[PDB]
Amino acid sequence: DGTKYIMFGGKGGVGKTTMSAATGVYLAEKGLKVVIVSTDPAHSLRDIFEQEFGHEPTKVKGYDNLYVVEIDPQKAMEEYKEKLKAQIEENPFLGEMLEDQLEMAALSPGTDESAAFDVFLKYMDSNEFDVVIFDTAPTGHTLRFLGMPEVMDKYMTKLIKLRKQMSGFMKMMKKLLPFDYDKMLEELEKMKERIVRARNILSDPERTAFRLVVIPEEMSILESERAMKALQKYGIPIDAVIVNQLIPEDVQCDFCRARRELQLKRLEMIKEKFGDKVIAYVPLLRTEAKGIETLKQIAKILY
Amino acid sequence: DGTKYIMFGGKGGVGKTTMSAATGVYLAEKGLKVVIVSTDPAHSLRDIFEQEFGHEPTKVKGYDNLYVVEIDPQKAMEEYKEKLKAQIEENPFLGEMLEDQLEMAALSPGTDESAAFDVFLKYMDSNEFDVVIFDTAPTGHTLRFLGMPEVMDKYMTKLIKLRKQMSGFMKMMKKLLPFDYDKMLEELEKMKERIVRARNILSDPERTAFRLVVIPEEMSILESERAMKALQKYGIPIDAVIVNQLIPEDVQCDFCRARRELQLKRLEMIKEKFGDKVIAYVPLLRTEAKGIETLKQIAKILY
Amino acid sequence: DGTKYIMFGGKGGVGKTTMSAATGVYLAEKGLKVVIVSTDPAHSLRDIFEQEFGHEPTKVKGYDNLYVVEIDPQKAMEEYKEKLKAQIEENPFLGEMLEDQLEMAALSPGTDESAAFDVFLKYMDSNEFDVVIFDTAPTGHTLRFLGMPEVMDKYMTKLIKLRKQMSGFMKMMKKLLPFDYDKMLEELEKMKERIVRARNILSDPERTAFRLVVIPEEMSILESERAMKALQKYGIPIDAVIVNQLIPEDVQCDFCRARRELQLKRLEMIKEKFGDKVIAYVPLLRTEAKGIETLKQIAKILY
Amino acid sequence: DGTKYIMFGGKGGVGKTTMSAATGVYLAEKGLKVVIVSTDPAHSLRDIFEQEFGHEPTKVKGYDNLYVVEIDPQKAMEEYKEKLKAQIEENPFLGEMLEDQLEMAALSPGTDESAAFDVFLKYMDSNEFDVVIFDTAPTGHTLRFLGMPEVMDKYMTKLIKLRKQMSGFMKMMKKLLPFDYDKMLEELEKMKERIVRARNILSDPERTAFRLVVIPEEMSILESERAMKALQKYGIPIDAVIVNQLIPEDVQCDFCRARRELQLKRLEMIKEKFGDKVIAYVPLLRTEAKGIETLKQIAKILY
Ligand SMILES: Nc1ncnc2c1ncn2[C@@H]1O[C@H](COP(=O)(O)OP(=O)(O)O)[C@@H](O)[C@H]1O
Ligand SMILES: Nc1ncnc2c1ncn2[C@@H]1O[C@H](COP(=O)(O)OP(=O)(O)O)[C@@H](O)[C@H]1O
Ligand SMILES: Nc1ncnc2c1ncn2[C@@H]1O[C@H](COP(=O)(O)OP(=O)(O)O)[C@@H](O)[C@H]1O
Ligand SMILES: Nc1ncnc2c1ncn2[C@@H]1O[C@H](COP(=O)(O)OP(=O)(O)O)[C@@H](O)[C@H]1O
Ligand SMILES: [Mg+2]
Ligand SMILES: [Mg+2]
Ligand SMILES: [Mg+2]
Ligand SMILES: [Mg+2]
Ligand SMILES: [Zn+2]
Ligand SMILES: [Zn+2]
């Protein structure tokens, strides 16, 4: 088996980023070559491991086999601006215009999320990593493109018809009046296949493990439940739910007691909705979840 | 004064969505007509107010003046597919092709974030709402487009030169051989102005209040600090920081005591970094922050 | 009445060019401001008047009011290459490319005949000349474009439908994702009108006199007859036929006698086919038809 | 040797069409398979051979090996309109539009001359004919496109540069933003080669004989001299000049004597200017040059 994919998702700020770091560590404990890929422009991972990372995979300190890759459209952008600037030298006018268009792209809202997309696909076709752990929160909408290939197929057929009708007209035009679709079709197909390979790898349990992270709070439970549902529609298996920031059993003050009782209610809720799934529990730490120490500790708690 | 804009941002899951709902309620308490606009595909607000919302503003129950708008590119999409399907009737072939292209857009990653962008601009040019509260997390990168206008200006000038050189050539082509830019420039300018109006309204304190939400945890404090900085570079004023999920003073078990001590450290950190700003504090509730009751309560606590 | 148009056509080498020059002279005899416009790249007129002419109207020597304009796509071309070269200076790369495309146009076969077309239309919309005499041989096919307006009309309507269907689609494209026909329709209409004004002026006897030149030879008679027919289909009136190079009555040698007899047969043919039209006869000169002397003489013979 | 090309040019109405028909006959006399190709929309050849011809080669009556092809853009057009109308059936809207655009082409002035061009090229790449005789008057300007290949080369190189700079940018946009020249270059090259093969065949004496036809009149002599010069600049050899419509030596009336004296002057002129070339003389017939009889007679006179 070439490469295995784990990915963590769930509501905002529940430990997606924390669990993926801890899983990275644990899987690195067994000798395995693991990369964690992060779309946080927040660059959460920096704050966790207490180390700088880049758009090119970096070894986490202490580990030869743990890497983190943080997608930064802007950096790779500027690198490319400097590079293209050399090519354009024959033509400053075209060159400055292309520079401008580039920048304009870079600043437009969609484009940051689609840098992420391109990276995602590059790592879905990749080898050289035993395990790739996607930190970036998938959802029904984030993965909505897996439905793309079918539409792409329809559209491609319409294009094919169109190409045939044009080719008849154009030839006559050239003959009578002196003096494209292949390219468009090629691109469409290339992408269609990339996405199809991806959808097959994610929809296959052997290769990819999707994991949901929740808090004992109605909100996280409900979001992550809906998520489970959309994903269930794509074919993506969810092997596990991880409850996190559980208040531990030894609590005394009226406060902790109260919040813990509420948490137990929500744990009945979780056990109800996701109960058909493996559920792991993680407690709320006295310390913040920060060091590689507390990380190894968390990983141990998960296993 | 026509319309006022409040917007909350800060790390993932710190209470952006919660504070904006509570501010919505409080501002509605004083008779005021307030809309909360949400880019969460999570649809958090549904879970908070315990009510369904749509891409068209909906009254929160019990309130004539409180509305929630949830941007859903997909819904407005399908509405439009059904609509366009009627226009295309003369030409199924072109019609089906346009349908396809549409769907392909919809599924592409960027496009979801730019639906949000379009709505944002529509509400920036809008009246009819006394207060518009943006729930969607702005950051340096989410607002990076406010720098667009200037690049747009450069590019527009290059386009103007180009138009003049083409018109000389084209005229000659037409006479010598039988047998665009105005449109492009018009669009560019239209958008440039929209964004400039927006940048002026957000950079103006009288009109827009930007608010940061943090947890006493090194991570949220650091993110929201960087955010503060990027925003400070656009000219966007940050009038207030709201610390949230503060463990209250009455705590007994060793656990709460420990976490509270840590929080107090981080409160010295917040007081340090944002201290030049107004800081409001909110406690961690025994109950989940859910009902309109606990919402009015939170609002009261904020004021 | 603003401007009057005479035009001569008929087989190759029958005196189109000769009769137009003589008509130019005669009409200039009565004080009248007359321009002869010539598409011969042969530049026949130079050889007739024994003088150089250019793409800008030139006074024939001895006459303030007689001008000749010889359309030379190539000259006006080079003039324009030199001019455009100054505009492109900011961008040599775009500039040299445009230069190349221009030259490529210039050398392509159609383009020489359409330079003629453009001039023709410029003089059809013109004032400042009492009489414009087109030397260039019209025929059914040379004037076939007068039927253009109607097709242009159909096509325009299809374009209008198309524009409406696009505007519905493009409009959503922009909102969903960031970030022509008016121009095409404007051009189409501009030309359609130009051609319609033209067809109305030529189809009008008061304004334009179409004249056919023949030799007493089966060939010229047949060509010019077919010409008469196509033209009759456009609504173009043919006011006169001019038989030319008639062998005079005083002839002696068996040779002249023979050819003259043949000519008289063909004159019965002409009188038969065109008889419903005014027919003028011109004899075959002992001298070549060259000088302004023989020209005034010919004109006198015509009137 | 595959195919040989003869082509006759000279002033309007000097016997281009007559000499080419006579050469056709003579070459067919020796068993040889000869086609005459005519761009006259006049359809002169019909009048000569007294027979109908079409855009597909037709045997001249009495001859298996003598064909005439008359290029008629309009006929081949209508044939094609009827054909395309069947293909478009799935889409009337696109179909009618294409029909319209076609007609518009057909009526446009250039397009008739370029139909001729296309045919010319088809017969330059052709076999199946021992001898192809081009009736259509070449000149410096009619053949001016033979200079096209070099400009085509320059432009192609600019295109190549452009293609490389686009491919860098395009790849980057696809990757950053979800989600032609090959075709243009292919066409350019295809045509460039076609024209180069042509220019090599015409510039080669072994394969192609260019022949100039004149009248003993200053005009024809001057035109055909300039023609000789432009052609000499393309590398096209002119093997022969044919003086035509020479008044014979037996003449009596003062008239014939006069015109003949003038002709002898112009014959000194021809002998002067073209004297370095083979010159054949043809007399002015008592009969019109019409029947296949007088044609065989003329051919005998040429040989
Ligand atoms: N068990 C835990 N005890 C204490 N803090 C935790 C625990 N799990 C997560 N956290 C903290 O919650 C915050 C956000 O979680 P995180 O996974 O980083 O966000 P996201 O899921 O939005 O990337 C971090 O400060 C993290 O250290
Ligand atoms: N003062 C509080 N006490 C208890 N829970 C809170 C408090 N403030 C926020 N929360 C809870 O934190 C979770 C996420 O915060 P939220 O603002 O709702 O998300 P986002 O910030 O991404 O829109 C929710 O489950 C919410 O109820
Ligand atoms: N009456 C005439 N006597 C002798 N030659 C004539 C007469 N009329 C015309 N020609 C000659 O016929 C030849 C070509 O005719 P022309 O009409 O000038 O060419 P085109 O019609 O193609 O421009 C010239 O030599 C011209 O001078
Ligand atoms: N030797 C000749 N004697 C008499 N008439 C001739 C002679 N040669 C050509 N002609 C006549 O000249 C006229 C036109 O010549 P043609 O070659 O058809 O025109 P083009 O050269 O413009 O195609 C015809 O009437 C033709 O019969
Ligand atoms: Mg995260
Ligand atoms: Mg939220
Ligand atoms: Mg002429
Ligand atoms: Mg001819
Ligand atoms: Zn406690
Ligand atoms: Zn005589």
Instruction: Identify which of D217, D223, D255 to mutate to test ligand 3's pocket (most ligand atoms within 8 A of the CB).
Output: D217
A90 and C94 within 8 Å at the Cβ level: the answer is no
Phi and psi angles of residue C279, each rounded to the nearest 5 degrees, phi first: -120, 125
D12 Cα nearest atom in ligand 3? 22
Rounded to 5°, angle at Cα D65 from D63 and D70: 90
By C-alpha distance, which of C286, C264, C216, C260 is closest to D255? C286
D251 and C256 within 8 Å at the Cβ level: the answer is yes
How crowded is residue D229: how many other Cβ atoms within 10 Å of its Cβ?
A: 11
Pairing of strands B131-134, A278-283: unpaired
Q: Which residues are CB-neighbours of C174 under 8 A, at least 6 positions away?
A: none
Residue with the two structure tokens 């990593």: A129
Alpha helices in D16-72 (DSSP H): 16-29, 44-49
Examine residue C179 and say whether the peptide bond preceding it is cis (omega within 30 degrees of 0): yes
Nearest-by-CA chain A residue for D122:
A175
Q: Kindly list the strands in the beta sheet with A4-10, ordered across the sheet, starting from the edge strand earlier in the chain.
A: A58-59, A66-70, A34-38, A131-134, A4-10, A208-214, A238-246, A278-283
Asked whether the CA dihedral D87, D91, D92, D96 is positive or negative, the reply is negative
Cβ D9 vs Cβ D138: under 8 Å: yes
Contacts of C258 in chain D (CB under 8 A): 286
Instruction: Establish whether residue D288 lines the binding site of ligand 4, counting it when its CB lies within 6 angstroms of any ligand atom.
Output: yes
Cβ B105 vs Cβ C173: under 8 Å: yes
Taking phi first (over 0 means left), then psi (-120 to 50 degrees means alpha), and beta for anything else, what does residue A43 get? Answer: left
| Secondary structure (3-state) at A277 | coil
Burial class (CB in 10 A: 0-12, 13-18, 19+), C76: buried
Alpha helices in A125-253 (DSSP H): 148-176, 181-203, 218-234
Instruction: Establish whether residue D13 lines the binding site of ligand 4, counting it when its CB lies within 6 angstroms of any ligand atom.
Output: yes
A179 and D168 within 8 Å at the Cβ level: the answer is no
Question: Which technique was used to obtain these atomic coordinates?
Answer: X-ray
Question: How far, in Å, is the centroid of ligand 7 from the Cα of C22?
Answer: 13
Chain C 97-156, residues with CB within 8 Å of chain A CB atoms: 108-110
Confirm or reject contact between C31 and chain A (CB < 8 A): no
* Cα A174 to Cα D187: distance, rounded to the nearest angstrom: 10
Expressed as residue numbers, the domain containing B99 is: 1-303
Task: Name chain B's partners: 3 or more CB pairs within 8 A.
Answer: A, C, D
Residue with the two structure tokens 């449109």: B183
Rounded to 5°, angle at Cα D227 from D222 and D233: 135
Phi and psi angles of residue A209, each rounded to the nearest 5 degrees, phi first: -110, 115
By C-alpha distance, which of A59, B169, D108 is closest to C118? D108
Helices and strands: H and E segment counts in chain B: 10, 8
Q: If you write DSSP's letter for every residue of D109-150 in order, what string do you get? A: HHHHHHHHHHHHHHHHS--S-SEEEE-S---TTTTGGGGHHH
Question: How far, in Å, is the centroid of ligand 7 from the Cα of D254?
Answer: 29
**Chain A interface disruption, residue of D176, D183, D185, most A CBs within 10 A:** D176
Q: Which residues are CB-neighbours of A255 under 8 A, at least 6 positions away?
A: B247, B248, B250, B251, B252, B256, B286
Cβ A111 vs Cβ D176: under 8 Å: yes
**What's the half-sphere exposure (Cβ side, CA atoms, 13 Å) at D76?**
20
Instruction: Establish whether residue A213 lines the binding site of ligand 1, counting it when its CB lies within 6 angstroms of any ligand atom.
Output: no
* Cα C263 to Cα C245: distance, rounded to the nearest angstrom: 10
Q: Kindly list the strands in the beta sheet with D238-246, ordered across the sheet, starting from the edge strand earlier in the chain.
A: D58-59, D66-70, D34-38, D131-134, D4-10, D208-214, D238-246, D278-283
Q: Which residues are CB-neighbours of B171 under 8 A, at least 6 positions away?
A: none
What is the CATH number for B58?
3.40.50.300
Pairing of strands A131-134, C131-134: unpaired
**Chain A interface disruption, residue of B74, B100, B139, B294, most A CBs within 10 A:** B100
Q: Which residues are CB-neighbours of B78 under 8 A, at least 6 positions away?
A: none
* Cα C151 to Cα D107: distance, rounded to the nearest angstrom: 9
- Counted residue by residue, chain A has a size of 303
Contacts of D155 in chain C (CB under 8 A): 97, 100-101, 104
Confirm or reject contact between C168 and chain B (CB < 8 A): yes
Confirm or reject contact between B93 and chain D (CB < 8 A): yes
Tokens describing residue B252: 């007994």
| PDB resolution in Å | 3.3
- Into how many domains does chain B fold? 1
Residue with the two structure tokens 């076939």: C144
Cβ D280 vs Cβ D239: under 8 Å: no
**What's the half-sphere exposure (Cβ side, CA atoms, 13 Å) at A150?**
6
Question: How far, in Å, is the centroid of ligand 8 from the Cα of D16?
Answer: 6
Alpha helices in chain C (DSSP H): 16-29, 44-49, 73-87, 92-107, 109-124, 148-176, 181-203, 218-234, 254-273, 292-302
| Secondary structure (3-state) at A12 | coil
Residue with the two structure tokens 């509260």: B133
Q: Please identify every residue whose CB atom is under 5 Å from ligand 8, which is an ion.
A: D 17, 40, 44
Is C13 annotated to bind a ligand? Reply is yes
* Cα B17 to Cα B27: distance, rounded to the nearest angstrom: 15
* Cα D146 to Cα D153: distance, rounded to the nearest angstrom: 13
Gyration radius of chain C's alpha carbons: 24
Q: Which residues are CB-neighbours of B230 under 8 A, at least 6 positions away?
A: B139, B140, B141, B143
How crowded is residue A47: how many other Cβ atoms within 10 Å of its Cβ?
A: 18
Cβ D188 vs Cβ D156: under 8 Å: yes
How crowded is residue A157: how many other Cβ atoms within 10 Å of its Cβ?
A: 12
B17 Cα nearest atom in ligand 2? 23
Instruction: Establish whether residue A285 lines the binding site of ligand 1, counting it when its CB lies within 6 angstroms of any ligand atom.
Output: yes
* Cα D149 to Cα D196: distance, rounded to the nearest angstrom: 7
Q: If you write DSSP's letter for every residue of B137-204 in order, what string do you get? A: ---TTTTGGGGHHHHHHHHHHHHHHHHHHHHHHHHHHHHHS---HHHHHHHHHHHHHHHHHHHHHHH-
* Cα B52 to Cα A208: distance, rounded to the nearest angstrom: 34
* Cα A61 to Cα A58: distance, rounded to the nearest angstrom: 9
By C-alpha distance, which of A144, A77, A151, A89 is closest to A117? A144
Q: Which residues are CB-neighbours of A297 under 8 A, at least 6 positions away?
A: none
Confirm or reject contact between B87 and chain D (CB < 8 A): no
By C-alpha distance, which of D132, D114, B250 is closest to C107? D114
Q: Which long-range contacts (CB under 8 A, 24 or more apart) does B46-49 make?
A: B46/B70, B47/A218, B47/A219, B47/A222, B47/A223, B47/B290, B48/A219, B48/B17, B48/B18, B48/B21, B48/B289, B48/B290, B48/B295, B49/B21, B49/B292
Calculate the alpha carbon distances from B244 to B241, B284, D192 in Å. 10, 7, 74
Chain A closest-CA separation from residue B57 CA (Å) = 22
Chain D closest-CA separation from residue B178 CA (Å) = 8
Cβ B25 vs Cβ B32: under 8 Å: no
Instruction: Establish whether residue C191 lines the binding site of ligand 3, counting it when its CB lies within 6 angstroms of any ligand atom.
Output: no
Calculate the alpha carbon distances from D286 to B39, B139, C110, C261, D267 in Å. 97, 99, 39, 10, 21
Calculate the alpha carbon distances from D243 to C120, D223, D266 in Å. 35, 13, 10
Cβ B242 vs Cβ B213: under 8 Å: yes
Looking at chain C, after which residues does the C atom sit over 2.5 Å from the next written N, breaking the chain?
A: 179
For D50-66, what is the HEC assignment?
A: CCCCECCCEECCCCCCE
Taking phi first (over 0 means left), then psi (-120 to 50 degrees means alpha), and beta for anything else, what does residue D43 get? Answer: left
Cβ D301 vs Cβ D282: under 8 Å: yes
* Cα A62 to Cα A38: distance, rounded to the nearest angstrom: 20
* Cα B223 to Cα B226: distance, rounded to the nearest angstrom: 5
**What's the half-sphere exposure (Cβ side, CA atoms, 13 Å) at A82?**
6
Burial class (CB in 10 A: 0-12, 13-18, 19+), A288: middle
Cβ D40 vs Cβ D134: under 8 Å: no
End-to-end CA distance of chain A: 23
